[PDB]
pancreatic spasmolytic polypeptide
Amino acid sequence: QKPAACRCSRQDPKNRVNCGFPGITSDQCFTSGCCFDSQVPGVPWCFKPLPAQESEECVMQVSARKNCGYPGISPEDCAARNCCFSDTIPEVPWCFFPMSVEDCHY
């Protein structure tokens, strides 16, 4: 169902991964659980969204993560400094700064 904007907004157009069959409409794309955008040329207009998070300020591409914790920092201690926490991808910052959800459009 319509992924929230930052899951869409926050991806680099060159890293979009196709979603939907070809000629799928805005609505079918969004309701397929993907992102529609018809303003950037040359890239998929119906693409898969970023993995969600509890807060949308924490949603970005793994590479845009700036470290905010330290090896082993607890999810509780990571929250105390008002940082995001995500232990799903290995070998990247599990505690990183969030980014103000505002750049986030469709």
